[PDB]
């Protein structure tokens, strides 16, 4: 609402870089936590059987 498209492109690109890096960090954290949950699920299924 405040910047015309030629500059808006630089400020938005800066926002894209920060938000994309934060989302990639989130997904990586979910993949590692999920892997530990997967190991726990294998232990729980083995104990169930």
């Amino acid at each position: 609402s405040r910047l015309d498209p030629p500059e808006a492109e630089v400020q938005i690109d800066r926002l894209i870089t920060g938000r994309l890096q934060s989302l990639q960090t989130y997904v990586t954290q979910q993949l590692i936590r999920a892997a530990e949950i997967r190991a726990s699920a294998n232990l729980a299924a083995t104990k169930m059987s």
Partner: protein, 48 residues
């Protein structure tokens, strides 16, 4: 592929406006150049 040669006369102080990302009476109402422009802008003094 092809080259376009656009030509016009402008005011000396206004030579700086014939560029990507510029504002002013000429850049806004007469000749707008795109921000992803590929090319060269050529100007010379033609007072004589």
């Amino acid at each position: 592929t092809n080259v376009y040669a656009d030509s016009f006369v402008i005011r000396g102080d206004e030579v700086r406006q014939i560029a990507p990302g510029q504002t002013g009476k000429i850049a806004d109402y007469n000749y707008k150049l795109p921000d992803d422009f590929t090319g060269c802008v050529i100007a010379w003094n033609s007072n004589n």
